[PDB]
Amino acid sequence: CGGACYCRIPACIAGERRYGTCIYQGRLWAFCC
Amino acid sequence: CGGACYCRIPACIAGERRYGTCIYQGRLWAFCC
Secondary structure, three states: OOOOEEEEOOOOOOOOOEEEEEEEOOEEEEEEO | OOOOEEEEOOOOOOOOOEEEEEEEOOEEEEEEO
16 A cells, blocks of 8 residues: 556646656556656 | 555555556656555
8 A cells, every 4th residue: 555656648647746657548648746 | 544555666566556657756666554
């Protein structure tokens, strides 16, 4: 629980920060932790 | 708990499935959940 990350379009959730980009299912996403 | 996934080189660990790819700090990683 915690210490991990997610992919989100268009942006990360308030409280999180964008650390890079995901490539998933042929779309680009924000990589958020 | 936030995100549940990680970026790993070279591959995911036990208990995980690869969902895509991360672009992080100028390189490519396995996106694992």
